Symmetry: C6
């Protein structure tokens, strides 16, 4: 009864810790910094400038979800049915979803592009209202028998930024964002899935949204452009992992190395 009130005993916390599964990024170093891969029941943020690869990682994650081998879990804790026919939701904030990139990534990966597209729900959000409502509707998707295992918010803050210009209404912006973050954390946890969000950085080195976002994101990264198609992801916040940097590349095959 208590868990229905949003509470969890210390024992409930430990138990649920065993049902955590992870999704590979197709990058050795990146998976390593992640301590296995992208964790479920948590929100992972990739913040950087445009072209840094935040969106590539999002597309790559939708493809990988469709490869049974890219999902790592404790067999005696997570049944094979729990992760069967896994579906992905991609909330698109600026029209960044590219089906052809999904195909390309699928092909070079030996996955059926057709299947990734068929199992990835795309929601085009033109304002913060839609963005937040789509997130909440993910429960409805799961209620219609869709095993949503990956939620992608690309991007987390552009609609809020575009709607709240002026530090005179920043509090209203922060509260709405905090509400969205609670929703994102709620579905990662209640539906044992991984939630990923992309974000931008401001002038001195912080992801947009302040602490309201930061205190609510379990894993946080800054993504920088190396030379050429190289990228470096820096994990600077995680509950128990060490801060570390991982280098990788973005090619015709997607995320690699």
């Amino acid at each position: 009864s208590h868990m229905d009130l949003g509470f969890k005993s210390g024992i409930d916390l430990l138990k649920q810790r065993s049902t955590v599964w992870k999704l590979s990024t197709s990058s050795s170093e990146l998976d390593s910094v992640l301590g296995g891969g992208l964790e479920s029941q948590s929100v992972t943020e990739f913040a950087g400038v445009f072209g840094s690869g935040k969106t590539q990682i999002m597309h790559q994650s939708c493809v990988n979800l469709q490869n049974p081998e890219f999902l790592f879990y404790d067999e005696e804790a997570v049944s094979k049915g729990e992760v069967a026919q896994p579906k992905a939701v991609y909330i698109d904030t600026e029209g960044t979803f590219r089906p052809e990139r999904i195909m390309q990534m699928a092909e070079h990966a030996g996955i059926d592009g057709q299947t990734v597209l068929d199992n990835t729900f795309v929601a085009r959000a033109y304002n913060s209202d839609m963005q937040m409502l789509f997130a909440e509707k993910i429960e409805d998707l799961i209620q219609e028998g869709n095993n949503i295992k990956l939620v992608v918010i690309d991007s987390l803050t552009s609609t809020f930024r575009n709607e709240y210009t002026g530090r005179g209404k920043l509090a209203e912006r922060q509260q709405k964002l905090g509400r969205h973050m609670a929703t994102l954390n709620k579905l990662a946890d209640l539906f044992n899935c991984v939630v990923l969000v992309t974000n931008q950085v401001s002038a001195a080195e912080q992801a947009i949204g302040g602490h309201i976002v930061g205190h609510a994101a379990t894993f946080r990264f800054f993504v920088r452009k190396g030379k050429g198609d190289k990228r470096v992801a820096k994990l600077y916040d995680s509950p128990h992992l060490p801060d570390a940097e991982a280098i990788f590349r973005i090619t015709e095959k997607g995320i690699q190395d």
Copy 2:
């Protein structure tokens, strides 16, 4: 089912791509820059100064909609009925609709002007509330048996600009705009129509409304005055078309060359 919620599988996206039809502008160069013509399912923005041709293109579009040969589409994906007895909605926020100019453009196009007027609904909006409400009521018009295939918003921002003065209400202005842009995209998508919007520019060049408007418009142009009756439309934003310029003219015949 998922579609009921606003989500589209990647496969659905590809499928909807096939039903996109285009409307000619009566200018080869502009049509070529558009990659064929003004696209259904998208919001196309024409931004420029007063007298730059924005309103003329809107009128030309209403006339052209009444000539079957001016609509281009895949006869394998779009039935004749889908585009039969097509009608236009012209939401006029400053009193720019001119039935006599419609008559003229039609006459010179070998199109009956009476037919254009009989199939063009004009909605005079004196404030932003009326403007947004009219846009929402387009669904009610369709539901009455009117095959709306062209929606013109001339102009998109004059009302919002006349109401929200001072950067102290900008947030509210931006949120109302975002709501309007969402509705415009919804009409274009759910009813497979072409949605055109005219807009102004501000001081190195930007269409009024910032990113809330920009991010939500699929095709964006800046229209400039050339010598005499000449004009140049510069497409600077599109999903996959190259950024190019097209020259054309505004004559007694309408848009030409």
Copy 3:
């Protein structure tokens, strides 16, 4: 069913045009500048300083409405029944209605004063709420069988200006005003009557209200004080008439010359 939704076809607009009737101002020059007289289906604004004659023109219009020979219309487009037993509504925001001036003007015009006073409804409005509500209640007067054919708002902006002092509530002011402008245009349109409004000006030359008012008034005048009882009305905005000035007098008889 479309007109029920506030939409009108191009054809409906032309048909609309055929039923327009005009009201003489008693000034040959002003009538000429107007293209015959004050048009129904449009809002006509007279802006200027106190004493420029705006209020005098409003009273003169109420008197002239009671002279069948001062209403010009196409007999084959408008029945004598539509313009029969015409009544006026005068919404007064500063207590400028003078029954004695009505009497004096009538007498000197060979019109029965009592008939003018008996067919002129006066509404004293002390704030914008009353002002706007009276305008909306004009529809109710009509249902009860009153052939309202002339609506006077003297003055248009006095109350809004007295309530929304400070450019900090200007946005709300502009929106309330836009709502009122829409209602005034609706009365003129739906009930085929002439709507006149008085207004003030400010510096380097503009009627109070900005574009929210400007875009919503079809005929716009600046009225200036000439020498003695002479006045000059300058039409600087109309759909198709030329910009021109008219000189007249305000005498014991009312508007003349």
Copy 4:
């Protein structure tokens, strides 16, 4: 029918003008400046500094209302029942009602003080909400069978000034005030009574409340202190009376000369 809607024909306006009655102020010169006495159906304002005699005039009006001979009216237009058992309402905003002063003025005028106190309702208002609600409830007092013929608001702006400090809420204060003025004029008009209000002045020389109050007060005075107990009431605004000054005194007998 049109009466229900707040509208009145020019004829009704003239008619109602015949039912106006006046209340003597006990001062010959002041009664003369007033054109006979304080008029019913109008709001009369007395603005001045503290100690200028405003409150004394309010008390003297409550006393005089109980002497049948201090009410002047057209016996052919106003019935004796209309002015029978007249009662006053004194809305007290700073605890200025003084029953002993009523007693003193009454006896010195040969009126039974007990009768005055017995027919004078006092409403102590501690904030603007109470002040306004009390004024609206005067209608309910009349609806219960009380012939309310005099309404005193002492003072009109006191509570508004105390509540709306800072000019960032001035618009809200001006609108609330405008709503209050509407109510005061409504009771004067609908129940044919005299409404008196006291007010303060500020820097040059203007009653507090601006035009919102000013356009809504039919007769306006500035009361000044003369030598000793002498006072001068200056009428600076009236519909058809000349602007003039009246000197009078405040003694044990009340207002005199």
Copy 5:
């Protein structure tokens, strides 16, 4: 019927003055300056710095209410039944109620302390809403049969001051305060009880809350510290008493001299 609407005839007002009773403060000088003691049907305010004795006066009053000889009234206007089993309500804003101080004052006064504690209702208010609701619930305590004859608000403004920072919120703070003052005056008046409030002062010399409070407090004191155990209460606002100072002391017995 008029009283039901909040109005009172002038006769009513006089009838009410006769039922006024007073509560001794234990200080000869203070009682003399008050005209006999703390008056019922009025709000009495003691303003000053921390340690000036405001709270001690509140405590002494709760104790004194339980000694019949400390209540002064006219037997012909107030029945012994009306003042029998009197009870006090103490609204505590910072946790200043001290049962041990009550016991002490009682003991030294020959009054049973348990009787005092048993007949004193304490309400700990942590914010303005609770403070305001507690005052309104006093009516409910009375309806339940409790003869509430004294209400202490310690302090009047602490919560309001803690919740409202910025001159841009001052308007809302003043209106909430005005609503609270209305309630305090209403219970003093309707239930014939004495209402006491403590307040702070600010720079030049005024009690916090401005005129909204000042205009609504019938008796007002500034309480200063003298030498050692001495304190001076200065009555500077009363409807009919002279402005005067009372010196008293805060001792083990409580208030004395």
Copy 6:
């Protein structure tokens, strides 16, 4: 009857004091400064910079709750039943709860860590709404049969601080804060339990939230860093204890000295 209305007689207050129990902090000096231990029916605040020991005290309290020898109470006033099977609520605002730390503290204290984890409900709050709602839901946990005797709010203000930036919202922040403080006090009082909260400090040494928080917290500490693992807890606000400092240490066993 009055208990329902939120009022407590002075006798109720004394009787209430009789049932207060205290919880050991495992620090002899700190327990001494506290007059015995953390008191039920009160809110105790620990303010200090990050790493000062606040969160550690919260964890140590959850652990100590499960050792009956650490709860001190009057057996004549409090039954073994009231404190039997006590449970704790830990509202986690930044993700600071650590089950492993709970295990370690228990283990080294001779307490079964599994028992502590099993009887401690954790609530992760990502915004002020959630934070406040969990607090209120504690009534539900108790209703469902859980003997909640310890409530931890870690931290009290990080969410409010992250949501309300700028002085233009400070009033709204203070009021939300006030409501939350009232709720915390209410559960401490009604369910006879200990309520602990952690807070930050700013600039000239004050806990965040100002007086709105300060006035509502019965025991207030500023916790600072000594040398190495030493810490000093300074009690600067209590109802009857002396202001004093207690040095303690944070080690593998937990809070000690």
